[PDB]
Write a protein that binds this ligand. Sequence first.
Ligand SMILES: *[C@@H]1O[C@H](CO)[C@@H](O[C@@H]2O[C@H](CO)[C@@H](O)[C@H](O)[C@H]2NC(C)=O)[C@H](O)[C@H]1NC(C)=O
Ligand SMILES: *[C@@H]1O[C@H](CO)[C@@H](O[C@@H]2O[C@H](CO)[C@@H](O)[C@H](O)[C@H]2NC(C)=O)[C@H](O)[C@H]1NC(C)=O
Ligand SMILES: *[C@@H]1O[C@H](CO)[C@@H](O)[C@H](O)[C@H]1NC(C)=O
Length: 285
Amino acid sequence: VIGDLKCTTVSINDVDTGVPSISTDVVDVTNGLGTYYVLDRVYLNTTLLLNGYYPTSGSTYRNMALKGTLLLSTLWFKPPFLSDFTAGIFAKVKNTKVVKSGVTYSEFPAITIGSTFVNTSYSVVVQPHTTNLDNKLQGLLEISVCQYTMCEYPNTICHPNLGNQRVELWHWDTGVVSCLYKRNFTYDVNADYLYFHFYQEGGTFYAYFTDTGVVTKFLFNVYLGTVLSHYYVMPLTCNSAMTLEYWVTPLTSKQYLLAFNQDGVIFNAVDCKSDFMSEIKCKTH
Ligand SMILES: *[C@@H]1O[C@H](CO)[C@@H](O[C@@H]2O[C@H](CO)[C@@H](O)[C@H](O)[C@H]2NC(C)=O)[C@H](O)[C@H]1NC(C)=O
Ligand SMILES: *[C@@H]1O[C@H](CO)[C@@H](O[C@@H]2O[C@H](CO)[C@@H](O)[C@H](O)[C@H]2NC(C)=O)[C@H](O)[C@H]1NC(C)=O
Ligand SMILES: *[C@@H]1O[C@H](CO)[C@@H](O)[C@H](O)[C@H]1NC(C)=O
């Protein structure tokens, strides 16, 4: 169980198979991927040593995406899918683009980061939403940090035009809900991959993002005053048979050597303590 409101009892499959296999991918930071621009300053034709929240080059992502249609399996809402959120996580999210009746769509999972996922605590939610405006599909990231009454078995659904067996049910809250943060951010519905840094330091939750290139850029922060402990990528139920990828690898406080080109772009990165050559390279400015 994720949150502890019994929101639904419709098409829940509690009988227990094996635990699903989670696909893996090797972390490669060489072209800048996994790094973010420094918000307070732009760098040009230079290379910089700094401390940040970075993944371990050479370790793995896990594809945390769960695609469904009608049946929600209870296994989806436990480890290894409910996972630990310590220092932070770096996300590599495929923008699944499926074509139906002349229209290309934009679908990928939503993620919640929280402690207990009870309405006595604050949970972060990053949920995509698309809407048809002037016969052209636009995309938003709906970002909020609230005292959500999260559900046991939280899911999202795809665009109605792709059809749905299920309603969307990841929290249940009729009244007013206290929110530390809420705003929407647009994203390019034509992007192949979206990239996310989520981390926490000194009671503050941070977030970075990009839908262009491989190097993220500051999205928001908010002071929570508490420590978050878990993340859950929610299953996305839909009638289209589509392929979802939500690759997550942990961040830790590390030292990276980043190279900035003439346009201010991070085009190369080195994880200093990852391998022996990276150690030496960082030790030679
Ligand atoms: C805050 O969360 C709880 C759920 O954890 C909400 O509802 C009650 O919770 C208790 C214990 O979990 C259950 O035994 C009750 O059955 C729940 N109520 C109902 C009507 O089912 C509680 O209402 C939430 N508060 C707000 C303001 O959303
Ligand atoms: C973030 O975007 C969503 C989607 O555009 C906004 O939700 C809509 O708001 C209108 C008016 O408040 C409602 O009548 C619609 O039903 C909402 N759409 C859905 C799908 O729920 C939301 O208000 C935006 N929030 C912020 C803070 O910008
Ligand atoms: C580095 O940056 C400057 C900034 O104008 C640019 O003109 C120059 O061509 C770049 N390349 C080198 C090798 O300095």
